[PDB]
Amino acid sequence: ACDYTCGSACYSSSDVSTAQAAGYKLHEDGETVGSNSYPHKYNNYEGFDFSVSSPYYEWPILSSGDVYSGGSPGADRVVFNENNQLAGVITHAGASGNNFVECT
Numbered sequence: 750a751c752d753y754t755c756g757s758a759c760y761s762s763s764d765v766s767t768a769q770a771a772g773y774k775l776h777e778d779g780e781t782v783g784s785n786s787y788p789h790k791y792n793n794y795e796g797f798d799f800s801v802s803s804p805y806y807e808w809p810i811l812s813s814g815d816v817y818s819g820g821s822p823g824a825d826r827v828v829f830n831e832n833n834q835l836a837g838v839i840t841h842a843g844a845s846g847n848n849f850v851e852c853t
């Protein structure tokens with residue numbers, strides 16, 4: 750059930766897969782939504798040890814279960830690459846500044 754824990758947000762594999770599919774599709778069509786223009790390149794400044802190759806893209810995953818459509822993105826993100834492989838699930842919760850910590 751709780752495959753990914755972001756602070757207090759709990760996401761299942763299906764939740765991630767659904768959000769990732771939506772984000773990858775917009776990337777594929779070259780579209781973006783929200784004040785921060787998601788999905789956009791994630792440079793991995795935090796230096797996370799991803800098992801998949803770059804480039805990476807961040808896309809918001811909502812605790813409500815809805816697919817992001819340009820509103821408030823919240824603190825959690827799913828990270829994917831050009832192969833639509835899941836690099837990881839990250840969050841701003843528990844981090845300082847605009848930094849991310851990996852969800853466990």
Ligand SMILES: Nc1nc2c(ncn2[C@@H]2O[C@H](CO)[C@@H](O)[C@H]2OP(=O)(O)O)c(=O)[nH]1
Nearest residue numbers: 785789790791792793794795807847848849
């Ligand atoms: N913290 C962080 N921000 C990133 C990274 N890659 C791109 N960014 C963007 O770099 C700027 C400083 O963090 C922000 O615009 C941020 O976008 P988001 O705010 O949409 O994450 C990354 O690897 N880590």
